[PDB]
A = this chain, B = another copy of it.
Amino acid sequence: SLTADQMVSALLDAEPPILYSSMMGLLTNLADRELVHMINWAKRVPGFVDLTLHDQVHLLESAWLEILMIGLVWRSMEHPGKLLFAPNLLLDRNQEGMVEIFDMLLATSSRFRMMNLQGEEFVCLKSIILLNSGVYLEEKDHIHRVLDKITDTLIHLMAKAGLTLQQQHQRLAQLLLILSHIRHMSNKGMEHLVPLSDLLLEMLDA
């Protein structure tokens, strides 16, 4: 029942902190620590906690790598040709099978830069990833109605910025098509890299 502005404000307030950092060990440890904060972010995405825990976990399990990637790309926008894994861990291209994903992450930053992706748009995109990556009756209906609400909210953000109706639906499409590439990176990422579900369940107990 939230308004678009209340949706945006809830997502903005829910943003996780930027954590700080042998290379792969460090990146794995950073990712593991960010995942905890991801869980607490997800609990604040409006609509998420109305799902069963089993469904909260399947969605997090499907989405977590995409969410880490889009977060990395978002905080890397202002660092052309580099990835800001942490404020103390800025890596460029020159830093097997890694450069291919690195280039794909860099291409995403470049796309966000070309689009001038806004922060309010970023948090909507992350929320969509959370609710969408695992959707493939009543529980899915609810997921789709929350997803619909985020679509309403993105359009509202674009109207408030003064875009024409045409530009609104063009930009909405451009943003959602980026999510196909983020999925693609996640799949390649998974290839390149106790069930995670048990870990996610434990994390939900704080």
Contacts and interface: CB of A to CB of B under 8 A. Distances in A.
B107 A177 contact: no
Interface in A146-167: 147-148, 151-152, 154-155, 165-166
Contact of A177 (B132, B170, B187): B132
Identical chains bound together, number:
2
Contacts of A108: 136
A93 interface: no
Given A169-B168, A183-B180, A191-B191, A136 B107 contact: yes
Interface of A: 104, 107-108, 111, 128, 132-133, 135-136, 144, 147-148, 151-152, 154-155, 165-166, 168-170, 172-174, 176-177, 179-181, 183-184, 187-188, 191
B183 A184 contact: yes
A147 B173 contact: yes
Nearest to A106: B136
A136 B154 CA distance: 23
Most chain B Cβ neighbours within 10 Å, of A144, A148, A180, A181: A180
Contacts of A133: 180
A65 to B, nearest CB: 12
